[PDB]
Ligand binder design. Sequence first.
Ligand SMILES: CC(C)N(CC[C@](C(N)=O)(c1ccccc1)c1ccccn1)C(C)C
Length: 175
Amino acid sequence: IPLCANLVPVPITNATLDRITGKWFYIASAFRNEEYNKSVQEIQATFFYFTPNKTEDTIFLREYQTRQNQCFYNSSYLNVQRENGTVSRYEGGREHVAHLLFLRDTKTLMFGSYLDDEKNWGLSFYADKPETTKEQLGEFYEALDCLRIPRSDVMYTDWKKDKCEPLEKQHEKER
Ligand SMILES: CC(C)N(CC[C@](C(N)=O)(c1ccccc1)c1ccccn1)C(C)C
């Protein structure tokens, strides 16, 4: 099985939307795009919820980000472009598009940014737990290997640093 196979766009079905539904933890990312490297540098932890709306091709996103030892919560909707296998988010006068990609491990997922551009591409890595196994991490490294991004360029979260669970639990009461 060739290295790049899981870096090819895959159309998103209802089944794909079911598979991504729920809580994910941000594990790691690496990009050649400087803007993304800059934004991500400062993220210490992040977890999020996806609630797809299959009929509107949107996904409701609730996001719990830790930067500078404090909790920033945002909710918004992503749009789904099923055929291209991408999801998009409007983030300040700009639509941002990412390819939804998969690894052998069904408890992970990744998003590819600027995948058609060798000067800007990158990958972000997510798991259903804030800790990953060495198998999950190797799959991610292999994907980076395909983009010729060295492993040493990877930026990681630190689940020790999460400042957001006290907000998530406070949100659970109301909902
Ligand atoms: C700052 C933080 C929010 N970013 C993630 C952006 C991302 C992605 N490409 O993984 C996305 C961007 C644009 C369009 C879709 C998805 C996403 C994935 C899952 C959840 C939140 N957001 C960093 C790690 C780059």
